[PDB]
Amino acid sequence: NPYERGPDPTEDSIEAIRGPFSVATERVSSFASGFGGGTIYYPRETDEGTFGAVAVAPGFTASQGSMSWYGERVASQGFIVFTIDTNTRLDQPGQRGRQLLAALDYLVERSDRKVRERLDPNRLAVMGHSMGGGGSLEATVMRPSLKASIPLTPWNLDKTWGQVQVPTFIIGAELDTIAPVRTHAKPFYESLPSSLPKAYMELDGATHFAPNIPNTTIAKYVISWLKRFVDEDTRYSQFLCPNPTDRAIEEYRSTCPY
């Protein structure tokens, strides 16, 4: 597999705060007109080849909604990670879908050579929080060529996602009152085709902003999902299938084995 990067993984390596790659950053004032800016995190080491990328959207203007902590922690595992600033307000999940794709298109078409020369533009993913998570779903319908989608405590009034063709990992928060798993995350998950590689992980005792605080249970499976699908890296299948049983997990659902 020519997309494999980094040492063979372990339970410890996917839980690591700091992965095997060193990380540099590129600040972007505006990645698309009207859509605001963000921070690009990327692996510095180039001897293993280029990397896939994930755009990461918030769902609030409040600092509580920041997605910054995903940046170094995921990039250091071998990804270009574009965290989208909270400043620009978006009130619809579809807009978040468009914003996610605009951030990816910046990486592919407009980025500085330090980023462009490290990027495989064929291997892109989306991830987002709240309406940004609804946006992750939206983006996969807008662009079926995406390799992976991770809706975090997602919010969307549209409950049907049977046309999604992108491997999708939904993370829910048991006690969430803003995007309750009963009416958002779980219906979204169950509507995804049984033929799609998909998973649902619910965090025991967690509330809506759980994804905005460093969380090892979130990180280890976000990393594993991106590895398995952005890099086609079956070294990471072991962590995804059969269903994880981490103590922090209230429930896990999947279409394992993939």
- Residue 205 phi/psi, 5-degree rounding, is 75, 10
Q: For residue 25, what is the enclosing H or E element?
A: strand 23-32
Q: Which two tokens stand for residue 178?
A: 């803003």
- Residues contacting 22, CB < 8 A, separation 6+: 43, 44, 45, 76
Q: Which of 129, 208, 224, 233 is catalytic?
A: 208
Q: Which of 66, 76, 130, 149 is catalytic?
A: 130
**Domain segments of the chain as ranges:** 1-258
User: CATH assignment of 1-258, given 3.40.50.1360, 3.20.20.70, 3.40.50.1820, 3.40.50.150?
Assistant: 3.40.50.1820
- Residues contacting 121, CB < 8 A, separation 6+: 107, 108
Active site includes 237?
Answer: no
User: Method of determination?
Assistant: X-ray
Active site includes 129?
Answer: no
Only one residue has tokens 């046309």, namely 163
In the chain, where do the E strands start and end? 23-32, 36-43, 51-57, 80-84, 119-129, 148-152, 168-173, 198-203, 249-254
Closest to 219 in 3D by CA, of 77, 42, 22, 103: 77
| Residue 109 assigned to a binding site | no
Residue 250's SS3 state is strand
| Residue 91 assigned to a binding site | no
Q: Which of 176, 224, 231, 254 is catalytic?
A: 176
DSSP 8: P
How many other CB atoms are found less than 10 A from the CB of residue 44? 12
Only one residue has tokens 């962590």, namely 239
Determine the Cα angle at 244 with ends 41 and 154, to 5°: 55
Active site includes 208?
Answer: yes
Only one residue has tokens 């510095």, namely 44
Closest to 126 in 3D by CA, of 137, 138, 111, 136: 136
How many other CB atoms are found less than 10 A from the CB of residue 242? 10
| Residue 252 assigned to a binding site | yes
Distance from C-alpha of 198 to C-alpha of 14, rounded to nearest angstrom: 19
| Residue 204 assigned to a binding site | yes
Partners of 203 in the beta sheet?
A: 173, 249
Residue 98's SS3 state is helix
| Residue 190 assigned to a binding site | no
